[PDB]
Design a protein around this ligand. Structure first.
Ligand SMILES: NC(=O)c1ccc[n+]([C@@H]2O[C@H](COP(=O)([O-])OP(=O)(O)OC[C@H]3O[C@@H](n4cnc5c(N)ncnc54)[C@H](OP(=O)(O)O)[C@@H]3O)[C@@H](O)[C@H]2O)c1
Ligand SMILES: COc1c(Br)c(Br)c(Br)c(Br)c1Cn1c(=O)ccn(CC(=O)O)c1=O
Length: 316
């Protein structure tokens, strides 16, 4: 589709972006310098990726050589769960601004619908292994997000891993100032998200799909797990197209009006990943892909299954 989808806030947003979860501080700068070199204009970031400083370096570097202008960059960070208490949102936002070395974000997401106990510990757990919630509610958190818009710190606000009932709850929030611009969710061939994707676009909310390649590098990957990249059925469509299994996987959600944010620190792969503004997949394959759906989640936040705002109990 069109390279820069438009958000319900006036801004357009690059449908392909560089993902930075699991990109170690020591490698992430050179990856963001490279990805910008090849053409990426969109960076997916989070405080909880513990590399924002290093990311921010690469971004400043490119501006101060005027390889790209600020207003050309679509930069996304997220508010981690330990920061939902409304009084802490602003500070968390400023901190990530300071890390990235930016005056403003193009998009700040509520990273998960679930509030954690505030601290340094990103995932605070009781003795049984479930996280320690805060009794914060979404709407209060969301309202602090809105204040960030009005204050000029962020240009848009979205949500990530929200079920539809959770988006609905914000939409129907009395006194609502801004509807969420984006829902960032897990989306890929073994989790096609047809129902929630439908719901979100219809409400005029742009859907970014995360872990498009299945996130083989996810730390808790069992060896016996399915691998998108090494699925014979998916390898074929790629050979048929004279492109890589990954390039398929990346163009797939793009042909659904989703935004997509593959992660790499491998400069070769980073650029292999951007070589997708120049072909098309057939409706034959598109529907075949959608048929592989196993309702399989890479990110299920299982330590939070007994959190009142755990989002994955809902069908969608
Ligand atoms: N909002 C949320 O809750 C949430 C959750 C998960 C992810 N996300 C976002 O989505 C981004 C992408 O998702 P992800 O990090 O889960 O995993 P992913 O993008 O599905 O896959 C990344 C893994 O695949 C490898 N890879 C990258 N390009 C490749 C290529 N062209 N060929 C073969 N292998 C390739 C990478 O290796 P190397 O890097 O070693 O090359 C890395 O190990 C994240 O980084 C994050 O920004 C958001
Ligand atoms: C639920 O909190 C934990 C816990 Br508990 C542990 Br242990 C780890 Br490791 C992570 Br990375 C997290 C946070 N987390 C996930 O669970 C799944 C994906 N991600 C990446 C993301 O949210 O973008 C997490 O940070």
């Amino acid at each position: 589709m069109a390279s820069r989808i438009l958000l319900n806030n006036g801004a357009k947003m690059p449908i392909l972006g560089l993902g930075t979860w699991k990109s170690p501080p020591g490698q992430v700068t050179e990856a963001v310098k490279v990805a910008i070199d090849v053409g990426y204009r969109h960076i997916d970031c989070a405080h909880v990726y513990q590399n924002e400083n290093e990311v921010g370096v690469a971004i400043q570097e490119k501006l101060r050589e005027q390889v790209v202008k600020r207003e050309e960059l679509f930069i996304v960070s997220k508010l981690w769960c330990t920061y939902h208490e409304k009084g802490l949102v602003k500070g968390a936002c400023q901190k990530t601004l300071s890390d990235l070395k930016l005056d403003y974000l193009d998009l700040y997401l509520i990273h998960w619908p679930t509030g954690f106990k505030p601290g340094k510990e990103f995932f605070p757990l009781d003795e049984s292994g479930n996280v320690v919630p805060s009794d914060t509610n979404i709407l209060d958190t969301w309202a602090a997000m809105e204040e960030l818009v009005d204050e000029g710190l962020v240009k848009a606000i979205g949500i990530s891993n929200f079920n539809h009932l959770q988006v609905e709850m914000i939409l129907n929030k009395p006194g609502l100032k801004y509807k969420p611009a984006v829902n960032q969710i897990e989306c890929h061939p073994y989790l096609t998200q047809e129902k929630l994707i439908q719901y979100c676009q219809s409400k005029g909310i742009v859907v970014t799909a995360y872990s498009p390649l299945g996130s083989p590098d996810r730390p808790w990957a069992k060896p016996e797990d399915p691998s998108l990249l090494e699925d014979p059925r998916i390898k074929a469509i790629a050979a048929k197209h004279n492109k890589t299994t990954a390039q398929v996987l990346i163009r797939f959600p793009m042909q659904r009006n989703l935004v997509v944010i593959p992660k790499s620190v491998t400069p070769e792969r980073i650029a292999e990943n951007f070589k997708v503004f120049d072909f098309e997949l057939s409706s034959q394959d598109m529907t075949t892909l959608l048929s592989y759906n196993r309702n399989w989640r890479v990110c299920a936040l299982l330590s939070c299954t007994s959190h009142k705002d755990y989002p994955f109990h809902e069908e969608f």
